[PDB]
Amino acid sequence: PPYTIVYFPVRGRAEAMRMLLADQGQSWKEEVVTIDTWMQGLLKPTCLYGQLPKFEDGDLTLYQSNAILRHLGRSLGLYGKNQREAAQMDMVNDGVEDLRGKYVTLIYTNYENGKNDYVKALPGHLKPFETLLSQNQGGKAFIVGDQISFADYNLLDLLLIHQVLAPGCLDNFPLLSAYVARLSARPKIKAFLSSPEHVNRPINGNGKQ
Amino acid sequence: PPYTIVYFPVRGRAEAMRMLLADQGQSWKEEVVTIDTWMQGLLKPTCLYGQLPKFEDGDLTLYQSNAILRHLGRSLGLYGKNQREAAQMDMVNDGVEDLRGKYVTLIYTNYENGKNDYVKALPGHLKPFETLLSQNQGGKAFIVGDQISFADYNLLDLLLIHQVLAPGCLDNFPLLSAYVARLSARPKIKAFLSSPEHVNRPINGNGKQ
Ligand SMILES: CCCCCCSC[C@H](NC(=O)CC[C@H]([NH3+])C(=O)O)C(=O)NCC(=O)O
């Protein structure tokens, strides 16, 4: 620490980490980078992969949203209780990422003409998480194990935005629905989800959700 | 252990882990799933995300290539020496995964009309790795730290398949160039890259590379 997040004025791939930091009683600084400033091309060249978010943890500067989540999961004891849970947690996050990737594609390059096919294919992409929950304490705990982890925050964020994209998409997935309500009920997460910093911040950057 | 890899008859997203197991003097079982078998629709329904590779480490079953690479690094000591290196290795791997995905799209959906543009933009996607190297002991060591990690194996594979797609794509990247020649010189890796199991197996599944 301290923690500094450099990203555009949206939730996107920074919202899950923000949620994680809040739930963990952590404080951080927001360095907002507007699209206009970005289009000037000054900062972009200084970014490892030419993209944001960029994270700062003390003398450590990081890029890649999932590397950041994993770094927090590890430095905050949110990566399972043994090596086996760490692997399962990675397997879950990689899955959350694959779906997030498809989400972004739809939102930014084919919303109007691709939304119907997306929502149609959505159940097939959600079932895997529903299945995982059913095999872990009847879905009464977390995605992996009985302790929250970095994967939970990413999964939760993705589920929350899909409910915005497609209301009722979790109606046929009771475990996922209860899971979302449960983790959302966590006091520090509930406070974050209703905080002005979050609400006043759009999900994406093209005004679509 | 023992290890078992369940994947299609191609190098694709499994060659990195195979190369890692080979370099670490590990033994594994190869269950090749032909396209004919796959199309029987019996295997896919049992895969978490309906996809391969599937990995077996004793009683642990895993999916997602990077999750498997991370698991192997964690249980074999190929994940850096501290939390700082571990995070940078994740940052590197996420970058490798991003480019590998662009590579996959090119190969399977637009090789003919996309190859020109792809090779032209490749330098921009390779430079970050050249930079990471120049900031780590002048690039005479590995991608992160002074010991081989899971990220090196994934980066090495990605670089090697790109040299096939665009020979000499590393001519303007001396560090990556020497890096590839150096890691390929490692005895267990040199034997791996020369083994019939590796040589006989095509890079991808459509005959393109
Ligand atoms: C209201 C404004 C909303 C803006 C939303 C911007 S999303 C920007 C986009 N971000 C990413 O690609 C993040 C990738 C993520 N870190 C990963 O896992 O690879 C980017 O860096 N783009 C860099 C570029 O385009 O040059």
Ligand SMILES: CCCCCCSC[C@H](NC(=O)CC[C@H]([NH3+])C(=O)O)C(=O)NCC(=O)O
């Ligand atoms: C000569 C034959 C060559 C075959 C190459 C097959 S690549 C197959 C494809 N594999 C993947 O998508 C792996 C994804 C990887 N695990 C990741 O998520 O990063 C799959 O399982 N697809 C499942 C499906 O399409 O239903």
